[PDB]
Write a protein that binds this DNA or RNA. Sequence first.
RNA 1: UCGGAGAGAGGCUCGGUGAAAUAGACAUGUCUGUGAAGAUGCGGACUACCUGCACCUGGACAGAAAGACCCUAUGAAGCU
RNA 2: CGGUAGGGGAGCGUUCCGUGUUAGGGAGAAACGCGUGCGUGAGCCGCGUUGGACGAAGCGGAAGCGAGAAUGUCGGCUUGAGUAACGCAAACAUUGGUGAGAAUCCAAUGCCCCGAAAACCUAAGGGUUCCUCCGCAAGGUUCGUCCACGGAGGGUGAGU
RNA 3: GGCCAGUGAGACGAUGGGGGAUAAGCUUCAUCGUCGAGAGGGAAACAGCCCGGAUCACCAGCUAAGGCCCCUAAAUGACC
RNA 4: AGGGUGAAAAGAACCCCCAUCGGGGAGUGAAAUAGAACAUGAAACCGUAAGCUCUCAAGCAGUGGGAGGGGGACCAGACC
RNA 5: UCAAACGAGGAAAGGCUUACGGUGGAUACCUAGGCACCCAGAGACGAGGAAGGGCGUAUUAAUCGACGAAAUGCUUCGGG
RNA 6: AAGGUCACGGCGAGACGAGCCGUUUAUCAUUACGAUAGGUGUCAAGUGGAAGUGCAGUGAUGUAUGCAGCUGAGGCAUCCUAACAGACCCACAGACUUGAAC
Lengths: 144, 193, 116, 147, 46
Amino acid sequence: PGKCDEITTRGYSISMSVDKARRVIDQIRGRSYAETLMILELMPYRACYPIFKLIYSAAANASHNKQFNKANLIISKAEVNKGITLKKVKPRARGRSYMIKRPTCHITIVLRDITHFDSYDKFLESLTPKKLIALLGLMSTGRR
Amino acid sequence: STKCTEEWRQLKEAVKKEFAIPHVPLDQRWMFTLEEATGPDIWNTTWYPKSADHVPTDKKWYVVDATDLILGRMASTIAIHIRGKNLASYTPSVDMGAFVIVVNADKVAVSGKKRTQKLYRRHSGRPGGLKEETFDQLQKRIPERIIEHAVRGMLPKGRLGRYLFNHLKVYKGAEHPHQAQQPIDLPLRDKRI
Amino acid sequence: MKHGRKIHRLSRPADQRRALLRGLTTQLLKHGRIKTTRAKASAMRKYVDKMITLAKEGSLHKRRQALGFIYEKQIVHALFAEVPERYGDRNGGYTRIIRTLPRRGDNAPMAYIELV
Amino acid sequence: VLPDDFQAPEPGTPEYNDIINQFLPKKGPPPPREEIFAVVVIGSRQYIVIPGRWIYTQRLKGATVNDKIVLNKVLLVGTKASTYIGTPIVTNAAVHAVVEEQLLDDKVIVFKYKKKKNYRRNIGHRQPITRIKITGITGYEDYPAST
Amino acid sequence: AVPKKRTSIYKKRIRKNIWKKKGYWAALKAFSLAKSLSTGNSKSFF
RNA sequence: UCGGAGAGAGGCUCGGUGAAAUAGACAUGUCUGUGAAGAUGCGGACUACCUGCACCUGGACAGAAAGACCCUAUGAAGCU
RNA sequence: CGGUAGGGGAGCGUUCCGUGUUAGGGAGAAACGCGUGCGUGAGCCGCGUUGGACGAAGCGGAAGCGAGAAUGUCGGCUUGAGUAACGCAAACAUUGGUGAGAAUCCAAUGCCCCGAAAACCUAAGGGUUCCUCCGCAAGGUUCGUCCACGGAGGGUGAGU
RNA sequence: GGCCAGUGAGACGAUGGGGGAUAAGCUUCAUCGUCGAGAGGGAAACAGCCCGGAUCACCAGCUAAGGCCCCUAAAUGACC
RNA sequence: AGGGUGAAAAGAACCCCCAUCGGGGAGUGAAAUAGAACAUGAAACCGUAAGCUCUCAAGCAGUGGGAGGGGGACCAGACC
RNA sequence: UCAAACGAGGAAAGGCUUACGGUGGAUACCUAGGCACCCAGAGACGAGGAAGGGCGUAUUAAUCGACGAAAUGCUUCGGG
RNA sequence: AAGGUCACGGCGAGACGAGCCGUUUAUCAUUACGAUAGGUGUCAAGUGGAAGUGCAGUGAUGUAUGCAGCUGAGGCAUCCUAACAGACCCACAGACUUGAAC
């Protein structure tokens, strides 16, 4: 859970295919809200616009539910899953019939502010662990 | 912050020095240090070499002089050192061998009628490309492919004989450009050459 | 192979391409600034430079060839009363190929033609 | 709901480096056993035996737990300087050992199948093994063969 | 013409990720166009 | 003979929508030999960095479809 | 003490029933997932920040009783694959308008097509598809603000 | 004898023959061995050829057939 | 062919994104990861994050040995 | 400084393992609905218009049930 | 950082990627480079005498202006238009070991 850092926004099963939503969602991973704001303004995809709608309604969410800024805010994971697929019995010649599936997505985009401490030096102190819980909230290479 | 990668890297190297232990070589060595008898049971299982046992820095270097030496028995006695079957550390899954250097590839002897009747033919994928090519034609043309074709069929042609194929250093001249580990001459056990 | 075939053919057959050229340069001379695709933009650029310099020398033969090329009647006679007063001393280069965003539905590279 | 804060107790970091450099490294000495070594013959197979080692072997015919058992079938007993090459057994030899609690080793799934001739057999085997701890080797002071 | 068998998860994730990496290559171009669309004298985008 | 050029609709690229037959799993080379007597899968050698795109179809005894031809059934049926 | 076709002996599991309104169980049953455990194995036992009300063992019985095969069968989801195709080669283009969003809806101007029709009316058939407003979940082989689509209301007047 | 099954398509190798062309991994018999229903080792691979009969474990030893230059375990062993 | 949110609709007042659909706070509830596609939700299937590792490599993808590396550990030799 | 030897260390899709998700509705617990016996009973109805339907009836959508221009119901006698 | 990639204007290159040539005070002067594509101005070149007028003819038509008129995928000249505005990748002595002289 990261101790109250991220903002998770889900999405409806929108009426488009999952894979093109996954190339346009694998583009904007890791980049902050300004770069995705200018790229998804100009990306030449039809899957671009509900993704930009969910980023916009995700950072406006992050500014109204929480109280953050739209500049120190990077996209955390932005996972796109499968949805419900409709079945369309479409006839074709020599008396055949083909199932044409209408696919839907399931977009869940997580946003991530930097709410940091930015400690002065690195040097380890193996004392007062009930302060070591609070001083270390998000770091790397956890030993013991 | 370069000090994150540099200083935490040197802390990881520091605890690499503190936790882990070096691996002692097998020279004037007894059974165990008193730390080793507390560690794993490396006695009753078969000894398997670690990474500090097959370092290519401290491998042996051998120089034969192929003047008036017959080809195939020289290739077998180069093979028996190129594997590592003259060492008691021989495991056939790792590269325990030794680098060899063969000078004077232009003057390799053969017995009988090899020089005019033994063919080093080759072929690409398409038909009608089988290249007629005899022993005197390579020995006139490129002699250091002779011995290199003799010992390549002596080594296990998988992923590991291909690795110890590069240990072979054959040169047609009278002088080799290597001064790597002061290459001691190769010991022979072949009374018929 | 297309070595040195400097005609710029569109995604349309020959006579339909001619009608696209005449109609789009006609309404280009009507409105001045126009939204095309870029292939249509350069294809307008050659022919509309031919139509500016065609009625630059306002004779009857140039006016009759120029009326023969352009569709609308009252736009050729609004042209030679305008191009020597405006596009004298320019000596070529009567347009500008300001590009814009691609078109929603095709990703068509979309351009925008001036008169300058 | 906010970023939490900087906390202000005004701490001072102890950079004396005589407490953390005492805490982080560990001083653990190995126990010096002695300079001796034998090769015992148990069942059929031979074991490298040094004084103090949790070996596994075969005997579950009968041997009580925590028993003090001499393994007198010794060949090639060896010190740091000299070894004693055993014409078959070194005489009056005694590897003192502690036969500990008996064990069953890991499962060896003996499953046999031939081919389309429809035959398959899942059986298993738990070998009745015995772990032995070694006390010390003695009775070995005849015919030295140092080089 | 008719496929003899099917592909693995292996080869399919390779080909689909080459398709989506081919989608990755056409947005740093869009980042460059979106960056040149910003404040500056550029003779385009009326 | 003996092909050659040009115009469209496809094919190639981009944006949208988006199947199908098929499919034991496929980490799916060539020669040569062996084998239920025509092997990417077994053996020896040689050759091949990984992975796409566009064409061609020699093989996968390719896909179809419980061989219409041949034979068997103490089968069925039409006809004489 | 190898074993196919096959024959015999001994067992595990499943759901229900007798004991059974059993022991146990919202202090977590069945399920589902887990094992440094035990068995010759079918399996048992134990642990679960998941789940929420049933239900063991032992001694016995009865089966719609055990799955990898039947070009089995019924649902779900893959491969081919983001590939073929997008339903004539009458042909559209621009400027405005509406909107959150317009190649596609509307308006205008040119261009182009049928014109013994690709025009208008009636027989059959269909049955509300006709008209205003609203909507864009599904359908339209793309989009859509549009629709023969969805919702509400209306509409078919005979002495000839 | 009682109860109760399968099987009744065999294949190759040696010997004894017939059919053939003393041709076939051919066909039919008679005795035997293997496979079928047989694992392992030798035979490069390879049902029937040789050794050999797999209850299971061991990071135990000795051997049969067959081998002791290298790939690949053991002799670049000795003497004619 | 399509059953089962709760015990009770107590079915989400109000704020933001916004044309809707939907989403996030807040509120109801014991449970909102019981939100109307709503009860336990398994496999195939599609994904994302973490550890190790593949671009001179021939392989029914295993298994025996195990280089190097990572993780918790307590019978620290063990386990994955 | 030069020459020679080795190719580590971080290096990509992906492979494995683990964790968390989405489609999916197997498993577990049910039921709102069925199946089969036993004991009785009934197999009646209809020109006094039947079984079965069509249309319609409520203050105001559609569907089902009840009802029939006396229509989402009526008269009388009993229960409550 | 050097060097690439995108974009940009295209090609005697090309299915797409590639490749190649440009990417502007786009010379100044005494003598080879800083014209990429389009337009323009001319020159090769193709068809071949245009419109309008006059003349001859009753009229079809012929004739002079007039190798004129259109075409200009090719050559040269010309900065008139577009080569603007950018963006991104790759950085920070290149592990370990021997020999030689300095």
